[PDB]
Amino acid sequence: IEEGKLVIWINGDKGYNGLAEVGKKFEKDTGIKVTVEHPDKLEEKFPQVAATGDGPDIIFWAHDRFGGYAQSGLLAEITPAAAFQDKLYPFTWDAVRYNGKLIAYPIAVEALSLIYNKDLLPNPPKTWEEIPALDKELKAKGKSALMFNLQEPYFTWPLIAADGGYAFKYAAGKYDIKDVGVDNAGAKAGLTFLVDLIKNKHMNADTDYSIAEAAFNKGETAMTINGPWAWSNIDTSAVNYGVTVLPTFKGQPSKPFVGVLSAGINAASPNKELAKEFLENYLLTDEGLEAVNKDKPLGAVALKSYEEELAKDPRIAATMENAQKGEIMPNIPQMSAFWYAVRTAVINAASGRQTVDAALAAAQTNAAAEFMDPATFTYQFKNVRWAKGRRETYLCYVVKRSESLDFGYLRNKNGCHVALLFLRYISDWDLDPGRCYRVTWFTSWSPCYDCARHVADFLRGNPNLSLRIFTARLYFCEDRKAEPEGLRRLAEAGVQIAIMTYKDYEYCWNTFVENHERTFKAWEGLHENSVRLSRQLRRILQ
């Protein structure tokens, strides 16, 4: 990693030649060389390539990706002056805030808007409630009122959240992953309205992005819901199209997720002051943003002065308005479980498989985290030999795609063993045979014979699923030594079985436990018992 020199990473779909122009001016004035790279898949790169040797000095990406970096400690904390912060819209600073600290500079703002055909619909509706009648009217004329992608919750959330639904509760640059607004009354209302639009044949349950885009671009529908990225395509077609504020629901604005293009600084960068000088005095300026805007449109921008210039284009003003009425995309990783849950819900409610209430309840439980009591964990997962009296069995689990679809813990309930309860849970999911899933268990007890058997058969029935089991203790029922054959059966089915080591207890302590910010405290003989049990399991597995 060079010193006295700036290396900038930004995606290829951005304005990087304009950015290179900016860096050229910076190099001209300060004699400090600046090179813009736009490598393919840089956002996947950075969390690793930068975590060790070097990376870029500055990285441009949507803010939600930075949170994951920030907790890894890969992003330098910034403290720009109030005088500089006032140059940007205050809500954009909230997007670059992680755990109370500012981890990046806001650049651009994007959100969904209501795109309408001006020839079909010169006066687009202000409310969602208007849309059924309007559709009934347009369907007599061979058109439809509205088509947008219903398959992805990103597009359907603005309506669902309007009456008070939300992802995670946000305070002072911090998100509560235990607080989730998915099954609350507002979300119920919004999703009920959507499903009612489908039941009444105003919209179609199978409509997706390309279908909606094709429909609107060909003039087959009066409205669609979409972002700036779609605009040029509509430019190619012949459609007279406006872009305006999303319709209200029950008097309240639709609330789309707001992406914020942001510039983070490498925590491993020697050049941090150079980066701040560049970003503050060169990039974020009317001229600096103008430069990259010439190359490719940023959409709406975080800088007030230039946004006032860009907003003379009413579609950008619409983008900004919808953004200011929407909610900031949470930058926490648990968001991935949100996406999967809500999507599922919205599908199951749209096809009539589930009621709105049931779907949103399941989605709520999936998205919201439930943490174990610390004393409970310490007692139940102790790997020592006084292994009797732990009469229950606790199972911590993570379900992935690498995307973390679910995580949490179970315990034996009403006589039913915990492994079977998990099978019961995961069975209910509709898993795509096409896709592959990775499930990880941390169990206080190793499964008994019957549990191990049912798990083995389940995994035989689902080859797209793979399972790792990290166990604290090895369970045996008296007078059999049936259990070793069960474990052996699991290994035969392709289960990876291992005894929990210190690092596993660390992970569980900082993942599944409510620890009140206390470090994991090992007991005496943890490693000893772990090795002993490891040996023993090694004997059993042959």
Query: Residues interacting with ligand CAC, by CB under 6 A?
Result: 393, 417-419, 445, 447-448, 451, 475
Nearer to Ca ion, 259 or 408 (CB): 408
Q: 496 — alpha (psi -120 to 50), left (phi > 0) or beta? A: beta
**What is the closest distance, in whole angstroms, from the C-beta atom of residue 393 to Zn ion in the complex?**
7
Nearer to ligand CAC, 33 or 411 (CB): 411
Q: How far apart (Å, rounded) are the C-alpha atoms in residues 493 and 387?
A: 28
**What is the closest distance, in whole angstroms, from the C-beta atom of residue 397 to ligand CAC in the complex?**
13
Query: What are the CA-CA distances from residue 340 to residues 21, 69, 154, 326 (Å)?
Result: 40, 22, 11, 21
**448 touches Zn ion by CB under 5 A:** yes
**What is the closest distance, in whole angstroms, from the C-beta atom of residue 423 to Zn ion in the complex?**
11
Applying CB under 5 A, which of residues 451, 467, 469, 499 lies at the interface with Zn ion?
451
**340 touches Ca ion by CB under 5 A:** no
Site for Zn ion in 416-435 (CB under 5 A): 417
Nearest CA to 465 out of 516, 523, 405 is that of: 405
**What is the closest distance, in whole angstroms, from the C-beta atom of residue 411 to ligand CAC in the complex?**
9
Nearer to Ca ion, 329 or 405 (CB): 405
Q: Sign of torsion, CA 354 360 362 367? A: positive
Structure tokens at 307: 């946004």
Q: If residue 109 lies in a helix (H) or strand (E), which one and from where to where?
A: strand 104-110
Structure tokens at 238: 């012949």
> Which of ligand CAC, Zn ion, Ca ion, none does residue 257 bind to, with CB < 5 to 8 Å depending on kind?
none
> Which of Zn ion, Ca ion, ligand CAC, none does residue 408 bind to, with CB < 5 to 8 Å depending on kind?
Ca ion
Site for Ca ion in 91-130 (CB under 5 A): none
Backbone angles phi, psi at 523, to 5 degrees: -90, 175
Structure tokens at 126: 């202000």
Beta strands in 343-427 (DSSP E): 394-400, 404-411
**What is the closest distance, in whole angstroms, from the C-beta atom of residue 477 to ligand CAC in the complex?**
8
Query: For Ca ion, how many residues bind (rule: CB under 5 A)?
Result: 1
**What is the closest distance, in whole angstroms, from the C-beta atom of residue 406 to Ca ion in the complex?**
7
**What is the closest distance, in whole angstroms, from the C-beta atom of residue 385 to ligand CAC in the complex?**
16
Q: How far apart (Å, rounded) are the C-alpha atoms in residues 53 and 278?
A: 23
Q: How far apart (Å, rounded) are the C-alpha atoms in residues 404 and 401?
A: 6
Q: What letter does residue 64 receive in the DSSP assignment?
A: G
**What is the closest distance, in whole angstroms, from the C-beta atom of residue 467 to Zn ion in the complex?**
15
> Which of ligand CAC, Ca ion, Zn ion, none does residue 445 bind to, with CB < 5 to 8 Å depending on kind?
ligand CAC
**What is the closest distance, in whole angstroms, from the C-beta atom of residue 76 to Zn ion in the complex?**
50
Nearer to Ca ion, 297 or 408 (CB): 408
Contact 451/443 with Cβ under 8 angstroms?
A: no
Nearer to ligand CAC, 158 or 486 (CB): 486
Binding mask 203-232 for Zn ion (x = CB under 5 A): ------------------------------
> Which of Zn ion, ligand CAC, Ca ion, none does residue 291 bind to, with CB < 5 to 8 Å depending on kind?
none
Contact 237/134 with Cβ under 8 angstroms?
A: no
**What is the closest distance, in whole angstroms, from the C-beta atom of residue 393 to ligand CAC in the complex?**
3
Q: How far apart (Å, rounded) are the C-alpha atoms in residues 60 and 264?
A: 6
Backbone angles phi, psi at 108, to 5 degrees: -125, 165
Contact 102/80 with Cβ under 8 angstroms?
A: yes
Q: How far apart (Å, rounded) are the C-alpha atoms in residues 373 and 468?
A: 24
* Residues written for the chain: 542
> Which of ligand CAC, Ca ion, Zn ion, none does residue 393 bind to, with CB < 5 to 8 Å depending on kind?
ligand CAC
**What is the closest distance, in whole angstroms, from the C-beta atom of residue 514 to ligand CAC in the complex?**
23
Site for Zn ion in 341-380 (CB under 5 A): none
> Which residues are paired to 410 by β-bridges?
395
Contact 196/263 with Cβ under 8 angstroms?
A: no
**63 touches Zn ion by CB under 5 A:** no
Nearer to ligand CAC, 24 or 488 (CB): 488
Binding mask 401-420 for Ca ion (x = CB under 5 A): -------x------------
The widest CA-to-CA distance across the chain, in whole angstroms, is: 83
508-511-513 Cα angle (round to 5): 80
> Which residues are paired to 65 by β-bridges?
none
- The CB-side HSE value for 535 (13 A sphere, CA atoms) comes to 6
> Which of ligand CAC, Ca ion, Zn ion, none does residue 475 bind to, with CB < 5 to 8 Å depending on kind?
ligand CAC
**What is the closest distance, in whole angstroms, from the C-beta atom of residue 367 to Ca ion in the complex?**
7
- The CB-side HSE value for 372 (13 A sphere, CA atoms) comes to 23
Residue with tokens 């972002």: 227
> Which of ligand CAC, Ca ion, Zn ion, none does residue 418 bind to, with CB < 5 to 8 Å depending on kind?
ligand CAC
**How many CB atoms are closer than 10 A to CB 358?**
14
Amino acid letter for position 243? V
Nearer to ligand CAC, 371 or 476 (CB): 476
> Which of Zn ion, ligand CAC, Ca ion, none does residue 422 bind to, with CB < 5 to 8 Å depending on kind?
none
Nearer to Zn ion, 54 or 392 (CB): 392
Enumerate binding residues for Ca ion (CB under 5 A).
Answer: 408
Enumerate binding residues for Zn ion (CB under 5 A).
Answer: 417, 448, 451
